[PDB]
Amino acid sequence: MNTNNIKKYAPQARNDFRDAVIQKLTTLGIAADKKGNLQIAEAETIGETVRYGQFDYPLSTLPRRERLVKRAREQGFEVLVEHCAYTWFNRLCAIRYMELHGYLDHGFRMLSHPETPTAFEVLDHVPEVAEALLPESKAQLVEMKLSGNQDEALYRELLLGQCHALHHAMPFLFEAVDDEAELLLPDNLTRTDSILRGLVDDIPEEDWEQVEVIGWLYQFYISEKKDAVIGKVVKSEDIPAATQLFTPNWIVQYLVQNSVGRQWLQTYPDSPLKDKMEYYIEPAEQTPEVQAQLAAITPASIEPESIKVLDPACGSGHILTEAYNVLKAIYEERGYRTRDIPQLILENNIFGLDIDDRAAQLSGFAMLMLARQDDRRILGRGVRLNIVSLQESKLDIAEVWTKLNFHQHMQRGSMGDMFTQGTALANTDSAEYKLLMRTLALFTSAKTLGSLIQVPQEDEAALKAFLERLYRLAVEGDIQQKEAAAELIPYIQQAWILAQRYDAVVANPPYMGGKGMNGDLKEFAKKQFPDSKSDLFAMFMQHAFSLLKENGFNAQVNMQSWMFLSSYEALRGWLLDNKTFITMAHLGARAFGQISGEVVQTTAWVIKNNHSGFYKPVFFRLVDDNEEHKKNNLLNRMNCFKNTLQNDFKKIPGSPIAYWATLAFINSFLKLPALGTRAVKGLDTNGSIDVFLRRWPEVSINSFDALGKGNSKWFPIAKGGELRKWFGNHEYIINYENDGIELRKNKANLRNKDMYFQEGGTWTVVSTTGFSMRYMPKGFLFDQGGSAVFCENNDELSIYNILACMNSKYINYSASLICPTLNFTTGDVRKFPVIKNNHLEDLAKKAIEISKADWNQFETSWEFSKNKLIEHKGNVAYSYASYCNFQDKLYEQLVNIEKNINNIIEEILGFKIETTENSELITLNSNKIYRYGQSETNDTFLNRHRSDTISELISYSVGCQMGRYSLDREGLVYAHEGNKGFAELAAEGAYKTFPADNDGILPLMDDEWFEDDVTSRVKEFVRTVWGEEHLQENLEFIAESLCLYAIKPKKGESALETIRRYLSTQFWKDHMKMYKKRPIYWLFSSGKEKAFECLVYLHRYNDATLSRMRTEYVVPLLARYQANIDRLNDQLDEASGGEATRLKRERDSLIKKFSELRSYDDRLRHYADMRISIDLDDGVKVNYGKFGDLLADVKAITGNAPEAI
């Protein structure tokens, strides 16, 4: 495996070389501070010796360092360090690869010795290698060999000579002479501490058998640094630092073989080439008109030396390798001389641009090695490549021109250009040359932009001629002319390369969103690409067509976001008006092996250049598989689709590419009215979420508009919610008094104000499972996340009809197809289809009635009437069975109604549709599946359901005891602040059947000392509701139900002990969970020990509550505890032995509780000193922290640890 050897060594070594570079800088008086300011020491010249502080060197090296000084100021310090580091790394890797494969003339290892670790073959053949490299001074080297010492110097000299020899064959990688990096070459190569030994014996040689390993370097040597430049804003320097990957071979072969091979086969269908190309795609059938039109432009014959392949982003160059393979196959088929084939291919068949010098060097080396593998006589001819990297333009305008002395050699020295000197074309004009100035002016910020700079085609041919002249000046001119030509070559070369027109383009554009783009890049994108400015690859794809000529091709692999999203929507339209698809493979996630994360969802597509809307493309579906399975399925031609016309994509609104979609569905989409613009967007508040939004049960009924009359301070407001059908989620209240004067002060957004308080349908803007719409009566306000629907004053579309249509399977499927991201903005909803009928109205009415009846059986709804179990007088089990039967009947009725609606819609449309996830889910609390989620098996939710029912019964009984509920009348009894009016209700006899506590304080202890014990009142309530004869069996049943799932059953106890334990242990958690951390019953606990705990109703509370509670409870409890302690102490002397022991220990705990109680009393004393009065409108979360530690779980509610007095 590659990662076993190449990885775990490539990244670390990247830093190591850099360190050596720093060392060299320290030896040359070159340094930078923390801020990066230049700290270059001043050279001292004494005795032809240069000194930089302490270090010294011979005078001959002085001028070279001066160039480095320029390198210090022309660019960044770290830039130069990294440049030298990767240059040396690439050179060493290339030398190792060449020596291992034995392509050298002499055929001797340099970095190691065969069958002898830590040695050198050249040391055994010094005269031969010296003659091969340096015949002129070999004898002196032999003297060094005669010396036996200075082995390091001899090795360094041999390495430098080998590099100089290798310069000629690869001018783009090795320098001939006067290389500054020679001074930067690390010393002590012969010593074991040198990194050369690690490079030699850190990777097995068996990995050096294929070119593939080279590519891995391009993905590893920077990978570590990628981790430091990922997820942040990216500058120009770091543009390649986080957008370098590797591509699997099969994808590249699919891209290449279906672009050039198809063009070749169209001209010559009878050729023995399709057999070799395994990934070629057989075109589908076409109409005779399409065939006639296509055959009208197919060329009769194409010269082999006329095909152009261009790569805007080469990197490793494996795409170029595949192209070279295909072109070699074509040339061999034609019948040229075999060994002549490679060089010709490298002449006018490959072109590559990149933005990193390292990538260009790697690509050149890879191509040269691939060519060498087959041709033996390569490297003996000066073959010049065309894989280059862009260069910035900062040079003297005319000084280089003056040094050119063009008129002296041929012509055009002073004023002669391609045009006249004073032509003044565009803005560059011609101080010395027209074309030169025009070309140079367009590369001012080339490093910032890249391959996106456009060049006019008309200037192509002339440029070519100009290039030739420079080629005649590098060898047949004076020193000044040669250096000027060398300086000016790259700019003209890259301009001419960009100025051509090509046939096939293959590339893998880098991925970078809006965040990565800097200000300059973003403003350039906005200026140049209005329709694709969202992301880089969109601009890349749009611009790639600018270089293709007629009958071109574009093959690319990129993210699938442009397929559906509306941001690229216009782009999609522009594709469907002038282009013509050929093929597309949707890979989705789980592709790009050796890469963590499934966010990468990519597709590979091949698109023609001309326009023909009646062609039939070929698609594929390879989403749900692993890499090997995807490759096998593509090999086996799995999941094909050839039943779609290109023009049909323009009928679906939004123009989304949906290949797997049927045809009848698309046709039926058109002949149906749309929803129109009835949908509106809800209002929004700036930052007042916690200022006006509250839960309904925590405010006064008078302050509630829905419950109260006359004055209005609060209003319900729907907002979000989970999946829910036809009714629910009315659990948020907002403050809108005096037409939102406070909101207008807050400057909150207000939209469609005049249409408020109107009945209609509402849907959730941001969902996670699907789409659903719910009814809403009048007197409501809708949030921005609660965009609503309102029918016109006089139109045939009723709200019930729309609600019936929306929740059908057809609408859900269409919505899923349109927006696969589960996001529902107003605009997309505005273009939904809608049907018209009459039975749908009554069916929707019945569904709404059933849903509302289901929702009106819980305390969380203000429309609560009464508990279900108290309507049956037979028995507890009988009432439970009746309740279960009622829920089952509701479920069955809803299921039948949904089935009938679906059947009616399907028969109206006339074609069946598929079923998907959550297509038949029932959103009722009666359904155990929806209420309790999904488990491994059914039948588990019986004991839990019974326990929850009994818990609800106990909670209702507690609420009745508190006075909130009364059995005399239905609905809410008293929910007003300050307990005011309680005496009037007592006089009215609202609690006639069941007395209500006068002080609104519920003690909770383990003894029956208090006459108002919760347990005793519960027993009285049960005996009143269900009589006295069957009291014991009912209590046993309730205890069993509680022991089922609520708490672990105890070994031996009666019903009363179980009830008391459940109340003292589990009740608070259940209440908090039910009311979602906004409790209405406040618990005051003396401590963790059950010394004293009481419950208080929030509404009935007032200032006098605290002192009255303290006086009426703590002092009598203190007296009782003191008397019990005195009695126990008196009896302790009477008792003896173990009988006394159990009497003593508990006593301690008791007095411990007593002590704790005293402490609580002290705390109470503090709050007995001050009088506290609060308001509901302040906020329960706000007010809960006003009592210090008198409450429990204060951090859970208030969100922070409470203070202490």
Numbering used by the authors: 1 to 1205
Reproduce the article's own wording on this structure:
Anti-phage systems of the BREX (BacteRiophage EXclusion) superfamily rely on site-specific epigenetic DNA methylation to discriminate between the host and invading DNA. We show that BrxX contains MTD and TRD homologous to those of Type IIL R-M enzymes, and, in addition, contains NTD, CTD, and insertion loop in the MTD specific to BrxX proteins.
We have determined the apo, Ocr- and DNA-bound structures of E. coli BrxX. 2D class averages showed that the sample contained two distinct particle sets, enabling us to solve both the apo and Ocr-bound structures from a single dataset. The map resolution for the second BrxX monomer stretched from ~3.4 Å around the core of the particle to ~4–6 Å at the periphery; hence, we rigid-body fitted the first monomer model into the density of the second monomer (see “Methods”). Given that apo BrxX adopts exact same structural conformation as BrxX bound to Ocr, we proceeded with the higher resolution structure for all further analyses. The TRD and MTDs of BrxX are connected by a flexible linker, and the apo-protein exists in an open conformation.
